[PDB]
Amino acid sequence: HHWGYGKHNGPEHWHKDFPIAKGERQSPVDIDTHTAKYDPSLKPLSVSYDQATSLRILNNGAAFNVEFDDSQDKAVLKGGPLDGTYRLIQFHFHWGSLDGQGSEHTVDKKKYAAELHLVHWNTKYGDFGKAVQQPDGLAVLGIFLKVGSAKPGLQKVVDVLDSIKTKGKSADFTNFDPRGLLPESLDYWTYPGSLTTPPLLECVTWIVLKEPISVSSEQVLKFRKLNFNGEGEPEELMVDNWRPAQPLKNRQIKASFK
Ligand SMILES: [Hg+2]
Ligand SMILES: [Zn+2]
């Protein structure tokens, strides 16, 4: 009986095995746009993905991860509220059973159809494992997804989902360019937070883009065909794999614009 998104093992149950669930800097959070403050101290954000080397896509039972080669400085995130260089290790999404929900962060309580998380670790810590033992070990770039026109750069991901339908399945996924998932603007909100799935470690500097990307109904509908279960087990559609907004507590959300 492990954690999940159901009635008996969902987000409201996580604190029992992971006490930090009720911590001081948990994510996601609602982004109250009128409370956020423009921060002049924020340096320009740098997203360098031209050398990104994707390797595989995996259904881990919670979502599907597109993994990258992080043995060298290729795809990195720098600038903004960040000090140093953060290396891309994987990206995944969170989505709902309907277009009206799915995102983890919300904007003035608005829920988007999905949310993309590009996960990076601080290179000064040597590895992802050591990085998650530091308060500034990770940087996650969050991007909202709304339903409308199709996102060409997402189609290659959508088309391979049929090959990793169940938990534990993986497939080669080389030469995928994450630059095709980014909106035009890099305006963002930033705050200190945590991982949104167990172990819910508080080592994340969150950078959430204001501009969402548009994906087609057809594209997100295929996300909903994935399974939480493993092959040969009763089918449980992988939907609503998102954690709700958590208490902001002693934190302030800063804006890079205005
Ligand atoms: Hg940490
Ligand atoms: Zn996530």
Whether 231 and 168 have beta carbons less than 8 Å apart is answered as yes
Question: Ligand 2 centroid vs 65 CA: distance in angstroms?
Answer: 10
**Which residue from 103, 94, 66 is spatially nearest to 223, judged by alpha carbons?**
94
Q: Rounded CA gap, 123 and 73, in Å?
A: 9
Looking at all shown ligands, the one closest to residue 199's CA atom is 1
| Domain topology for 1-258 | Carbonic Anhydrase II (3.10.200)
Q: Rounded CA gap, 243 and 253, in Å?
A: 19
What tokens appear for 212 in the block? Answer: 């969402």
Whether 3 and 9 have beta carbons less than 8 Å apart is answered as yes
Q: Is 124 helix (H, G, I), strand (E, B) or coil?
A: helix
Question: Ligand 1 centroid vs 218 CA: distance in angstroms?
Answer: 37
Cα 184 to Cα 135, 143, 187, 197, distances in angstroms:
30, 12, 9, 29
Which residues fall within 8 angstroms of residue 78, CB to CB, at 6 or more apart? 45, 46, 48, 84, 85, 86
Residues whose Cβ atom is located within 5 A of ion ligand 2: 117, 196
Question: Ligand 2 centroid vs 94 CA: distance in angstroms?
Answer: 6
Chain mean position to CA 102: 12
Render 129-197 in DSSP notation, one character per residue.
HHHTTSTTSEEEEEEEEEESS--GGGHHHHHHGGGG-SBT-EEE--S--GGGG--S---EEEEEE--SS
Q: Rounded CA gap, 9 and 202, in Å?
A: 21
What phi-psi label fits residue 137: left (phi over 0), alpha (psi between -120 and 50 degrees) or beta? alpha
Query: Residue 199: is the preceding peptide bond cis (ω within 30°)?
Result: yes
Q: Is 116 helix (H, G, I), strand (E, B) or coil?
A: strand
Q: Rounded CA gap, 137 and 127, in Å?
A: 10
Which residues fall within 8 angstroms of residue 57, CB to CB, at 6 or more apart? 64, 65, 66, 67, 157, 160, 164, 170, 171, 173
Question: Ligand 2 centroid vs 206 CA: distance in angstroms?
Answer: 11
Question: Ligand 1 centroid vs 184 CA: distance in angstroms?
Answer: 31
Q: Rounded CA gap, 190 and 43, in Å?
A: 12
Cα 206 to Cα 29, 83, 85, 96, 188, distances in angstroms:
10, 13, 15, 21, 10
Question: Ligand 2 centroid vs 92 CA: distance in angstroms?
Answer: 6
The DSSP 8-state label assigned to residue 111 in this structure reads P
Task: Tell me the CB-side half-sphere exposure of residue 256, using CA atoms within 13 A.
Answer: 22
Quickly tell me which residue has 């991860």 as its tokens.
65
- Amino acid sitting at position 215: V
Q: Rounded CA gap, 177 and 208, in Å?
A: 20
Q: Rounded CA gap, 116 and 154, in Å?
A: 11
Provide the residue ranges of all domains of the chain, joining segments of one domain with +: 1-258
The DSSP 8-state label assigned to residue 17 in this structure reads T
Whether 35 and 254 have beta carbons less than 8 Å apart is answered as no
Dihedral (C-alpha) 146, 138, 21, 199: value to the nearest 10 degrees? 100
Cα 202 to Cα 16, 27, 77, distances in angstroms:
17, 9, 19
Task: Indicate if the alpha-carbon torsion angle 149, 151, 156, 159 is positive or negative.
Answer: negative
Quickly tell me which residue has 């950078």 as its tokens.
207
Cα 192 to Cα 36, 94, 189, 204, distances in angstroms:
13, 20, 11, 6
Please provide residue 163's backbone torsions phi and psi, each rounded to the nearest 5 degrees: -90, -5
